[PDB]
Amino acid sequence: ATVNQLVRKPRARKVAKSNVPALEACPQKRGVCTRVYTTTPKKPNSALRKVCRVRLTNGFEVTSYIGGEGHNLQEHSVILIRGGRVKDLPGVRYHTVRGALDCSGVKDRKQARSKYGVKRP
Amino acid sequence: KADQDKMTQALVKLQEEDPTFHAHTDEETGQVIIGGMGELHLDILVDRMKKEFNVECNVGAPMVSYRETFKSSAQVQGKFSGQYGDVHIEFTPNETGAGFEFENAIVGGVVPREYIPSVEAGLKDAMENGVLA
Amino acid sequence: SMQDPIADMLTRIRNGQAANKAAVTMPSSKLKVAIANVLKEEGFIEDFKVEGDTKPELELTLKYFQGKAVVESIQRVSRPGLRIYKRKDELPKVMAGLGIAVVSTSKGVMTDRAARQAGLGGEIICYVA
RNA sequence: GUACACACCGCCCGUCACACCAUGGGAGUGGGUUGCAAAAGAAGUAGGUAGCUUAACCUUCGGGAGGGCGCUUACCACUUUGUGAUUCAUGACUGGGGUGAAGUCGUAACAAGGUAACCGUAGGGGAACCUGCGGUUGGAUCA
RNA sequence: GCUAGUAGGUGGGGUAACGGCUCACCUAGGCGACGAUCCCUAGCUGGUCUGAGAGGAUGACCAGCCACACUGGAACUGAGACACGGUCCAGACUCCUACGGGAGGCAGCAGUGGGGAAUAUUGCACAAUGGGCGCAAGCCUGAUGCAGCCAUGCCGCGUGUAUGAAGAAGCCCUUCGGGUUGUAAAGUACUUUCAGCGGGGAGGAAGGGAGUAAAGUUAAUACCUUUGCUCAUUGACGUUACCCGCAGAAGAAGCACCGGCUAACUCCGUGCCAGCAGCCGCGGUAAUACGGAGGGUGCAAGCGUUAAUCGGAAUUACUGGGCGUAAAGCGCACGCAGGCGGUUUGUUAAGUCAGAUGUGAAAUCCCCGGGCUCAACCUGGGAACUGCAUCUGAUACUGGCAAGCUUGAGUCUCGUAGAGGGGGGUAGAAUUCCAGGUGUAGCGGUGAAAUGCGUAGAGAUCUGGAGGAAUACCGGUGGCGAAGGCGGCCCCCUGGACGAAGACUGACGCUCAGGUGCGAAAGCGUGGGGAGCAAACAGGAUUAGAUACCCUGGUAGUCCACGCCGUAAACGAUGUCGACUUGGAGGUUGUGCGCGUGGCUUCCGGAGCUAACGCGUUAAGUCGACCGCCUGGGGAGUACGGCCGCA
RNA sequence: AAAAUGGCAA
Numbered sequence A: 001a002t003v004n005q006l007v008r009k010p011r012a013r014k015v016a017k018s019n020v021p022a023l024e025a026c027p028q029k030r031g032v033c034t035r036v037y038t039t040t041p042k043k044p045n046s047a048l049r050k051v052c053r054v055r056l057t058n059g060f061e062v063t064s065y066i067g068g069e070g071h072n073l074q075e076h077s078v079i080l081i082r083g084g085r086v087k088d089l090p091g092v093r094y095h096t097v098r099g100a101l102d103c104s105g106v107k108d109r110k111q112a113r114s115k116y117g118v119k120r121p
Numbered sequence B: 001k002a003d004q005d006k007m008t009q010a011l012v013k014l015q016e017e018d019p020t021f022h023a024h025t026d027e028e029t030g031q032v033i034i035g036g037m038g039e040l041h042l043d044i045l046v047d048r049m050k051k052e053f054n055v056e057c058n059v060g061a062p063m064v065s066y067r068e069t070f071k072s073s074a075q076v077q078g079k080f081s082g083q084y085g086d087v088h089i090e091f092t093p094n095e096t097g098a099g100f101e102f103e104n105a106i107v108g109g110v111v112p113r114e115y116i117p118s119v120e121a122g123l124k125d126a127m128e129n130g131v132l133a
Numbered sequence C: 001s002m003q004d005p006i007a008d009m010l011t012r013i014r015n016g017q018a019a020n021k022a023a024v025t026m027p028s029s030k031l032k033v034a035i036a037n038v039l040k041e042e043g044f045i046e047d048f049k050v051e052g053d054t055k056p057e058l059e060l061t062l063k064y065f066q067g068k069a070v071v072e073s074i075q076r077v078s079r080p081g082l083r084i085y086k087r088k089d090e091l092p093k094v095m096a097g098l099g100i101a102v103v104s105t106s107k108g109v110m111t112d113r114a115a116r117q118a119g120l121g122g123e124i125i126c127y128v129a
Numbered sequence D: 001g002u003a004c005a006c007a008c009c010g011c012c013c014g015u016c017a018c019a020c021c022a023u024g025g026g027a028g029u030g031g032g033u034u035g036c037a038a039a040a041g042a043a044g045u046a047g048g049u050a051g052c053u054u055a056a057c058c059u060u061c062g063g064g065a066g067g068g069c070g071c072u073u074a075c076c077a078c079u080u081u082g083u084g085a086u087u088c089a090u091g092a093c094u095g096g097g098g099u100g101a102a103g104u105c106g107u108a109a110c111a112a113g114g115u116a117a118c119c120g121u122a123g124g125g126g127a128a129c130c131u132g133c134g135g136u137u138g139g140a141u142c143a
Numbered sequence E: 001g002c003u004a005g006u007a008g009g010u011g012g013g014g015u016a017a018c019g020g021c022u023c024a025c026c027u028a029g030g031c032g033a034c035g036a037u038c039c040c041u042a043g044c045u046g047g048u049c050u051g052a053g054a055g056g057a058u059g060a061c062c063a064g065c066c067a068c069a070c071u072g073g074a075a076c077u078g079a080g081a082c083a084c085g086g087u088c089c090a091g092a093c094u095c096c097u098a099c100g101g102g103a104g105g106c107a108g109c110a111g112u113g114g115g116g117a118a119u120a121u122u123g124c125a126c127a128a129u130g131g132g133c134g135c136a137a138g139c140c141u142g143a144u145g146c147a148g149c150c151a152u153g154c155c156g157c158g159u160g161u162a163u164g165a166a167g168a169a170g171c172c173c174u175u176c177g178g179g180u181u182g183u184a185a186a187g188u189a190c191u192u193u194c195a196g197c198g199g200g201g202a203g204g205a206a207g208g209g210a211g212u213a214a215a216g217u218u219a220a221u222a223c224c225u226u227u228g229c230u231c232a233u234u235g236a237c238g239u240u241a242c243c244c245g246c247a248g249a250a251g252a253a254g255c256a257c258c259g260g261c262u263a264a265c266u267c268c269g270u271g272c273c274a275g276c277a278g279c280c281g282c283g284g285u286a287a288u289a290c291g292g293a294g295g296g297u298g299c300a301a302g303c304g305u306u307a308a309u310c311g312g313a314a315u316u317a318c319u320g321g322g323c324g325u326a327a328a329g330c331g332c333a334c335g336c337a338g339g340c341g342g343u344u345u346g347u348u349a350a351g352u353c354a355g356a357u358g359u360g361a362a363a364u365c366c367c368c369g370g371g372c373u374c375a376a377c378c379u380g381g382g383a384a385c386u387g388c389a390u391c392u393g394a395u396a397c398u399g400g401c402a403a404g405c406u407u408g409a410g411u412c413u414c415g416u417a418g419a420g421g422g423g424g425g426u427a428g429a430a431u432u433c434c435a436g437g438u439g440u441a442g443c444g445g446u447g448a449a450a451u452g453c454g455u456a457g458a459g460a461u462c463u464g465g466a467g468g469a470a471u472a473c474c475g476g477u478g479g480c481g482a483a484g485g486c487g488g489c490c491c492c493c494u495g496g497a498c499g500a501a502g503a504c505u506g507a508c509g510c511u512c513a514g515g516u517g518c519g520a521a522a523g524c525g526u527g528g529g530g531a532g533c534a535a536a537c538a539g540g541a542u543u544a545g546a547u548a549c550c551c552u553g554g555u556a557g558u559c560c561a562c563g564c565c566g567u568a569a570a571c572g573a574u575g576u577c578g579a580c581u582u583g584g585a586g587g588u589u590g591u592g593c594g595c596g597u598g599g600c601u602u603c604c605g606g607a608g609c610u611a612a613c614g615c616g617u618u619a620a621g622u623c624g625a626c627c628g629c630c631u632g633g634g635g636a637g638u639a640c641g642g643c644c645g646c647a
Numbered sequence F: 001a002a003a004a005u006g007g008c009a010a
């Protein structure tokens, strides 16, 4: 690109849209679980992965992943969601936070307790 | 569903006012069970919910836990057809309160031992979901 | 068309040095002669000469130190498309001072060092290393 | 030569079936915002004066000057009407796209892929495609 | 595209003041591709974060400016307001009421409800600084000084420290030998910051109020003022910093991580399950990747996670990238605006350069210092603020003006080659059709067939006629044209290129967004024409099927005039113009004297370039000017809107 | 002459 051309039309940067739309520049958002269900992973991974549909205060409804072993979450439970997409689950762009609001910490967790909201023995 | 949300809020407020009133959602059935000191006590609270909170709801006796069983015995073949799976199972009624009994009576490796657990899992899952209701 | 004559002069030297040509000849002009003198004084070119009156021709005698061109690279910093002017403090340094930069100061065309000593800034004609 | 590399028992295209996701159209429908043509006229401010009234000034002592009030006019907020534009939401149904699963039908390309392939264009056909016309090599072969 | 107070003018009115500020009248202007208008978003700045820098992102705290004060509107008073705690009106809300009528505005401080992932006490003092009023005393001050809450951040400090093999137990691992935890702990000798308890103790305090003295002032040693002098007095913080004393290791470590990237490893459980995951991926019975344990690594009153910004990203490349084949050269050309432009002299000084001056708030940043036990923090001075205006110099270069020159470009004279274009005409060969003669049973087609044709005489052969279309050989890696393209011969009209030797003009040039023209085939419209060929279509075959390949037929179309369309792998997948940089073999077309010198063209190849393949004086080498274009693959060159088109 | 196809796998 010649200088004169660049003067006429400047170089433009990419939009670079975010990958966590529902959060809307908020570290966490709160939502009520409309449904809690298990979904199969994309290839080459085989499991039953726990997910929930949560209607956030912002009003966007997004699938969120309930991490750890076991969950107490049911329909109408209030949970706090954070950014983080599950590779092998399509349309899952958020993770539920264990130990926040209704969501309970993983039982019998002695390592990475803060991540799974488990209080020190 | 909109009435459900209103109902939940109404139930919370009523529970705050009256601690002898207990309202909880059964996770299994998804039914909301209301507990009270009297039928009138519950009727008032239901009426309040309808009038004060404008919640339309239907009140009935909670569904009792029900279990299914077989009365007669029969030998049945389940064939799935590459993907291949063939099993012959004899179902017989057990005594009342005897529970579930599974017997592997395969002889001579007609069915590979590796697939026996899969057969059991399939039966167990199907039994849990029932056959009638 | 020949919109930049000076660029052609530098190109002729560079191409001549690559081709192991003893001399490079171009149509003479006052600026080209001035730039040539700087190269001769800095010992990048052995000698320069002008011939003809109606149509003068500038001949530059290239020098090879060890069968390798003395001028490793020659580049036109200021061009018709984009002109570059530098203040005295901002005058460029080539190859950590090993190279020269031809600067057109008010007094005349001179090396960057000479212009910096003078304290007069000017347009940067080219970098010669 | 090759788009194959558990290596042609390779690879791989499209219709159709099913579930789901985002999206376009759609009798329209309901919000937001706004353009234009009008309407409207609280208060205030300015202008005029049917009338009413008047500490300081003047006076022939009657009044005069000047002012206030009221009325009226101009401007103008709310508000109101008609007709457009734009944006958002939703809509029976419908178009194309994407994602599964070992569904169905074929085999279009990749080897000369068994009618070389492909480009533009026109016609035809369940589908990939097929055919005509002109163009390209980003075709193999040649003993 | 926009605009009628609109643009300007004249007069009058108006403002503190200029002014369409306003009004009348007059003229028809003003604005915009250097983006008007309109739509969307937004307080601005000094600064902050990031970055080597250039940039990029941002504008919380502090400071400057602006706007706003329930919403909408208006004015009054005043030096100043169209006024947070003023007025009036209207509206929405809340409240009072005797129902007639009234009251109110936390985006001051604290606080409540609500919303949210989330953000503090309805504190103390006016002791200091500053402000209002006052002669002053003083009064007022949710400014401000302080306190409370919060790991939110930054900084500093602690949680002991020497000794300690018993290499204890206990844990984990183990080849059961042992190794590891680990001198770690116990054991022993010390130290006591900080916390706690006790006792001392700065500084922020200046001034003001009493007197008292002198001087000034005055009629006055009055009073007043001024400066000294003397005596009590002023501190919210506050149980102040700090110092000192006392007891005792007492009262004080957690979080994330260990497949690779990435420093840190095994064991056990689990078995494509449960799970993990930023990326790559891991898990199906020997998992350093899941969960737990031992051990280790990294950090530490924090440690992770999430969100957000910059970097790495040369991945929008000004610094600092590309476009033969990876994404990217407009199909080609003409050309306005714009960009750029040979050589010489004079002149000017716009750019450029130098110096000077004014300014560029303080703070921040940076440097050198100073003060808090140190640090964070506070602070003095300097630097820096890269900018801008003005003045005075310089004149190389760029520009302007003026005069030149010939070298670029162009004009003329002469000749050469050419399927260059448009128009009219004509020839020969062949096919088809029609008529007649001869003649007899096949013809035609295919891998093989069949459909089809023929005894109403085909096919074959000969003769005459008609009509349309294309021009064998020449013919060529040949030529011509900007590209698309252009092929028998003849005439007519017309474009371009090249060579030779002179003359002539005097930079008259190059590129080119927008714009305009031309632009294969197919297609469309109107009117003609129609031999051959042939989408569609029909029949026969082939096949599992055969909407095909093959066979027999056959319509549009192919042809002509005119009009439209505007696209192709419109390709050299290579923009245009100019300069420079080894060679060889050929083609075609001039020209000079076998040897030269021009134009064009084909193949090979050196340096160099390239990811490689290749390109290689016809560059994809080396440079310059200008333009077009690109920024992962799909979705998609599609949707929508616009423009254009008969479609 | 005709001559289709072989899920995804480690």
Ligand SMILES: [K+]
Pocket (backbone or CB within 6 Å): A044, A045, A046, E272
């Ligand atoms: K797996």
Ligand SMILES: [K+]
Pocket (backbone or CB within 6 Å): none
């Ligand atoms: K749809």
Ligand SMILES: [K+]
Pocket (backbone or CB within 6 Å): none
């Ligand atoms: K609609």
Ligand SMILES: [K+]
Pocket (backbone or CB within 6 Å): none
């Ligand atoms: K094909």
Ligand SMILES: [K+]
Pocket (backbone or CB within 6 Å): none
């Ligand atoms: K075609």
Ligand SMILES: [K+]
Pocket (backbone or CB within 6 Å): E020
């Ligand atoms: K005026």
Ligand SMILES: [K+]
Pocket (backbone or CB within 6 Å): none
């Ligand atoms: K105006």
Ligand SMILES: [K+]
Pocket (backbone or CB within 6 Å): none
């Ligand atoms: K307002």
Ligand SMILES: [K+]
Pocket (backbone or CB within 6 Å): E126
């Ligand atoms: K004070």
Ligand SMILES: [K+]
Pocket (backbone or CB within 6 Å): E317
């Ligand atoms: K660049």
Ligand SMILES: [K+]
Pocket (backbone or CB within 6 Å): none
């Ligand atoms: K031009």
Ligand SMILES: [K+]
Pocket (backbone or CB within 6 Å): none
């Ligand atoms: K000049």
Ligand SMILES: [K+]
Pocket (backbone or CB within 6 Å): E555
């Ligand atoms: K026909």
Ligand SMILES: [K+]
Pocket (backbone or CB within 6 Å): E612
């Ligand atoms: K190679």
Ligand SMILES: [Mg+2]
Pocket (backbone or CB within 6 Å): none
């Ligand atoms: Mg729709």
Ligand SMILES: [Mg+2]
Pocket (backbone or CB within 6 Å): none
């Ligand atoms: Mg009025």
